[PDB]
Amino acid sequence: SRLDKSKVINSALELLNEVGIEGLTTRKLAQKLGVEQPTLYWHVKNKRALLDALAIEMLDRHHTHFCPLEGESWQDFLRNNAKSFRCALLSHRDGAKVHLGTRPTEKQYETLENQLAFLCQQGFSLENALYALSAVGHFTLGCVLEDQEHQVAKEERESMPPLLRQAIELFDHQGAEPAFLFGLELIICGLEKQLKC
Amino acid sequence: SRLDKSKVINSALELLNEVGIEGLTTRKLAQKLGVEQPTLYWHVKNKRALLDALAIEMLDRHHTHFCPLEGESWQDFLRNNAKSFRCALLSHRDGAKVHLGTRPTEKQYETLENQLAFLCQQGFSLENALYALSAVGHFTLGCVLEDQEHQVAKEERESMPPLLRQAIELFDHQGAEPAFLFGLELIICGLEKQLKC
Ligand SMILES: CN(C)c1ccc(O)c2c1C[C@H]1C[C@H]3[C@H](N(C)C)C(O)=C(C(N)=O)C(=O)[C@@]3(O)C(O)=C1C2=O
Ligand SMILES: CN(C)c1ccc(O)c2c1C[C@H]1C[C@H]3[C@H](N(C)C)C(O)=C(C(N)=O)C(=O)[C@@]3(O)C(O)=C1C2=O
Ligand SMILES: [Mg+2]
Ligand SMILES: [Mg+2]
């Protein structure tokens, strides 16, 4: 044990994959680290705090499109931002659940301010620009949550009208990705509309 | 004890409110009913099955706009359908989590077939019509999940750029409802677009 925040979060990320969000505990975490449970406090207070750092960490590694490139349309940006957010959530077991209920923190202030200012100078009012953000985040979270639940819920469970069958089979056969890429693009047309004003 | 499925689900709905989704168990349920745990099996196999019935029940009571009224635009219908779905999820503690990962069941076949056929005769292809449905459901679920988590997550936790502050305060001050009504309406403009074809 070199004893590191970075090693704790690494190890916690692994443990999340092993047991998932409900089964994750600080007790189980220290044991995986081969340390006593008081020691691990020097890095995490408790489960919520641990979960906040896991959520933060998943963005650090995977949410790469947190920032607009100039010349890149706001439209492409809401697109690539949602994509990498999605990508962040999917990176681990219960990724979307680990994010749920988190809020902006100090180290995101600059990223997030830039995010609203980028939209604003495109001509969205601050209000619509923050609603453009929540619509995309709510929608993306909704997709990954359903998509992520699908598997554990299919484990624990065991004939119809032909259009419904066709619809389910089309839905089932096409991944989460198209269902995701589709709504994403409906939201972007709503916003292309709104902005025209 | 008259011993009823209807009484079990009533009582389970109550228990969900008391302890929430993770703390709900069949063990805790029978004890609330004043019965032994074998007895309660004659109505529910296990937690997943219980959760499926709770999810079903919340739609029965509250998801009233499951069906289009002719003369009612598809647009008004996707609107009122999302609204009452939302309404279903919010009706109980962890309502949105209880739905997560559920799938269409036999008694929904007629409702749901009608739902895709209604859109189809409006001129959506089956595929887009099922994507119009998932976009709205994913988005609605994403809203209520975040909205529902907000409170428990605020219990268990403890300064910034002024536009971010303004954005948070605007966001915070305006309920979940506007953030919800907004994305909903972006999705509907995307679909008003797509259909034009
Ligand atoms: C293909 N078909 C669209 C599927 C496929 C997988 C699914 O997991 C689901 C659907 C239909 C949708 C219908 C949506 C609908 N609406 C968009 C809210 C809806 O009215 C209902 C309902 N029972 O009225 C659903 O079951 C629903 O909430 C739902 O849970 C679905 C759902 O779980
Ligand atoms: C007002 N502002 C938009 C708020 C308010 C409450 C919130 O709970 C949140 C935001 C910003 C959004 C930004 C979205 C952004 N995007 C739409 C995916 C985003 O890029 C980030 C990010 N850190 O890059 C978020 O924090 C974000 O995922 C997020 O978690 C937010 C979030 O949790
Ligand atoms: Mg967030
Ligand atoms: Mg569903």
Last residue of a domain, which of B40, B65, B90? Answer: B65
| Structural domain boundaries enclosing B112 | 66-197
The number of domains in chain A is 2
User: Do B58 and B118 reside in the same domain of the chain?
Assistant: no
A170 touches B: beta carbon within 8 Å = yes
A61-A16-A11 Cα angle (round to 5): 65
Taking the CA of residue A64 as centre, how many other CA atoms within 13 Å lie in the half-sphere pointing to its CB?
A: 4
User: CB-based contacts of B10: which residues, under 8 Å, 6+ apart?
Assistant: none
User: Do B88 and B155 reside in the same domain of the chain?
Assistant: yes
Helix (H) or strand (E) holding A156: none
Last residue of a domain, which of B43, B65, B87? Answer: B65
Residue A66 to residues A69, A87, B157, Cα–Cα distance (Å): 10, 12, 25
CATH for B102: 1.10.357.10
Last residue of a domain, which of B65, B99, B115? Answer: B65
Question: Ligand 1 test: best mutation among A151, A168, A174, most atoms within 8 Å of CB?
Answer: A168
Closest CA to B131 of A67, A35, A36, A171: A171
Backbone angles phi, psi at A148, to 5 degrees: -70, -35
User: Do A90 and A166 reside in the same domain of the chain?
Assistant: yes
Experimental method: X-ray
Please report, to the nearest 10 degrees, the dihedral formed by the alpha carbons of residues B117, B123, B127, B131 taken in order.
-90
- Whole-number Å distance between alpha carbons of A174 and A180: 11
A57 touches B: beta carbon within 8 Å = no
The answer to whether A24 and A92 are in contact (CB under 8 A) is: no
Cβ within 8 Å, pair B116-A168: no
- Whole-number Å distance between alpha carbons of B94 and B50: 14
- Whole-number Å distance between alpha carbons of B144 and B59: 15
Question: Residue B71 has what DSSP assignment?
Answer: T
Q: Whose CA is nearest to atom 3 of ligand 1?
A: B130
Question: Residue B69 has what DSSP assignment?
Answer: P
Closest CA to A113 of A101, A129, A102: A129
The answer to whether A4 and A12 are in contact (CB under 8 A) is: no
Taking the CA of residue A91 as centre, how many other CA atoms within 13 Å lie in the half-sphere pointing to its CB?
A: 23
- Ligand 1 nearest atom to the CA of residue B99, by list position: 30
| Closest residue in A to B148 (Cα–Cα) | A101
> Taking phi first (over 0 means left), then psi (-120 to 50 degrees means alpha), and beta for anything else, what does residue A69 get?
beta
> Taking phi first (over 0 means left), then psi (-120 to 50 degrees means alpha), and beta for anything else, what does residue A140 get?
alpha
B138 touches A: beta carbon within 8 Å = yes
Amino acid at site A137: G
